[PDB]
Design an enzyme around this catalytic site. Structure first.
Site, PDB file in Angstrom:
ATOM      1  N   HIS A  40       3.476 143.513 -10.333  1.00 18.48           N
ATOM      2  CA  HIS A  40       4.561 144.199  -9.665  1.00 18.48           C
ATOM      3  C   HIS A  40       4.828 143.263  -8.758  1.00 18.48           C
ATOM      4  O   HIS A  40       5.114 143.805  -7.218  1.00 18.48           O
ATOM      5  CB  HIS A  40       5.029 145.410  -9.595  1.00 18.48           C
ATOM      6  N   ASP A  84      -0.206 147.193 -15.924  1.00 21.76           N
ATOM      7  CA  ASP A  84      -0.035 146.401 -14.854  1.00 21.76           C
ATOM      8  C   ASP A  84      -0.530 144.966 -14.568  1.00 21.76           C
ATOM      9  O   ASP A  84      -1.805 145.286 -13.342  1.00 21.76           O
ATOM     10  CB  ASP A  84       0.155 147.489 -13.494  1.00 21.76           C
ATOM     11  N   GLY A 175       0.836 146.797   0.128  1.00 27.74           N
ATOM     12  CA  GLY A 175       0.092 145.215   0.776  1.00 27.74           C
ATOM     13  C   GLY A 175      -1.330 145.129  -0.052  1.00 27.74           C
ATOM     14  O   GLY A 175      -1.191 143.806  -0.048  1.00 27.74           O
ATOM     15  N   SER A 177      -1.034 146.209  -3.061  1.00 27.09           N
ATOM     16  CA  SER A 177      -1.225 145.566  -4.722  1.00 27.09           C
ATOM     17  C   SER A 177      -1.995 144.050  -4.846  1.00 27.09           C
ATOM     18  O   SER A 177      -1.927 143.460  -4.172  1.00 27.09           O
ATOM     19  CB  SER A 177       0.797 145.810  -4.625  1.00 27.09           C
ATOM     20  N   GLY A 178      -2.249 144.612  -6.312  1.00 27.58           N
ATOM     21  CA  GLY A 178      -1.996 143.171  -7.242  1.00 27.58           C
ATOM     22  C   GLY A 178      -4.458 142.911  -6.513  1.00 27.58           C
ATOM     23  O   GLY A 178      -4.491 142.190  -7.188  1.00 27.58           O
TER      24      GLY A 178
HETATM   25  N1  LIG Z   1      -2.611 154.223  -3.151  1.00 24.65           N
HETATM   26  C1  LIG Z   1      -1.407 153.300  -3.327  1.00 24.65           C
HETATM   27  N2  LIG Z   1      -0.343 154.070  -2.803  1.00 24.65           N
HETATM   28  C2  LIG Z   1       0.051 152.285  -3.272  1.00 24.65           C
HETATM   29  C3  LIG Z   1       1.423 152.883  -3.000  1.00 24.65           C
HETATM   30  C4  LIG Z   1       1.898 151.050  -3.229  1.00 24.65           C
HETATM   31  C5  LIG Z   1       0.517 150.074  -3.298  1.00 24.65           C
HETATM   32  C6  LIG Z   1      -0.401 149.963  -3.786  1.00 24.65           C
HETATM   33  C7  LIG Z   1      -0.680 151.476  -3.171  1.00 24.65           C
HETATM   34  N3  LIG Z   1      -2.514 152.130  -3.207  1.00 24.65           N
END
Ligand SMILES: Nc1nc2ccccc2[nH]1
Ligand SMILES: [Ca+2]
Length: 223
Positions: A40, A84, A175, A177-178
């Site tokens: 994503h 993902d 933020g 993410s990944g």
């Molecule tokens: N816990 C949690 N909540 C999130 C929301 C967006 C991206 C990663 C995330 N990890």
């Protein structure tokens, strides 16, 4: 990262920042020319930034390399976030040393109770947005599958696991993410999703990397 601490400059040498004029996702360096992140986080125009601590200041140790190609898992489902994971090939290889280094892929999956390190430059507030300049860290345990499924009934596949605290207060967030979830020196997870950040009984969900090692190896071998 909510409820975490300042990692300390270059203490997480495999952490990378995916940049498109601003930091939008994290990733992990697994060899000098490849990074693993979340599907994503895909977009075109990605510049991978290695050896960072303050992402708004060039402090030295940074290496900015453009991505040559991003390979999203063919079975990634953007509605369920199943599979993902994405691989990014760098235009040129990174120079590895003590400040920039790769992390190892696992040979076996981790068990519930394993303590892991999650890091990133994502939001530090559960109710509001505060993005940090430097890298934040959080130590969190992998939860049992029953607690994870009880928290997200019908939304957890075999390629996901929950890690965190059910009491709330500490968690990954937008933020992050990944980015990496490292346990005993092996990359076991990728920050994927969650319901809000650090809310009680809503732990973060991570892509279960041990399920993709052969895919990663085969894909890198053919690209
Ligand atoms: N816990 C949690 N909540 C999130 C929301 C967006 C991206 C990663 C995330 N990890
Ligand atoms: Ca910097």
């Amino acid at each position: 990262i909510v409820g975490g601490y300042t990692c300390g400059a270059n203490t997480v040498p495999y952490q990378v920042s995916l940049n498109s004029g601003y930091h939008f996702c994290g990733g992990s360096l697994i060899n000098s020319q490849w990074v693993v992140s979340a599907a994503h986080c895909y977009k075109s125009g990605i510049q991978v930034r290695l050896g960072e601590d303050n992402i708004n200041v060039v402090e030295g140790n940074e290496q900015f390399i453009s991505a040559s190609k991003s390979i999203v898992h063919p079975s990634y489902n953007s509605n369920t976030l199943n599979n993902d994971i994405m691989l990014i090939k760098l235009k040129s290889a990174a120079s590895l040393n003590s400040r920039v280094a790769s992390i190892s892929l696992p040979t076996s999956c981790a068990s519930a109770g394993t303590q892991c390190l999650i890091s990133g430059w994502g939001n530090t507030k559960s109710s509001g947005t505060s993005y940090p300049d430097v890298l934040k860290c959080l130590k969190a345990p992998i939860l049992s599958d029953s607690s994870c499924k009880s928290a997200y009934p019908g939304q957890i596949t075999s390629n996901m696991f929950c890690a965190g605290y059910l009491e709330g207060g500490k968690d990954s967030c937008q933020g992050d993410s990944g980015g990496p979830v490292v346990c005993s020196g092996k990359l076991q997870g990728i920050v994927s999703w969650g319901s809000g950040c650090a809310q009680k009984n809503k732990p973060g969900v991570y892509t279960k990397v041990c399920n993709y090692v052969s895919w990663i190896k085969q894909t890198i071998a053919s690209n």
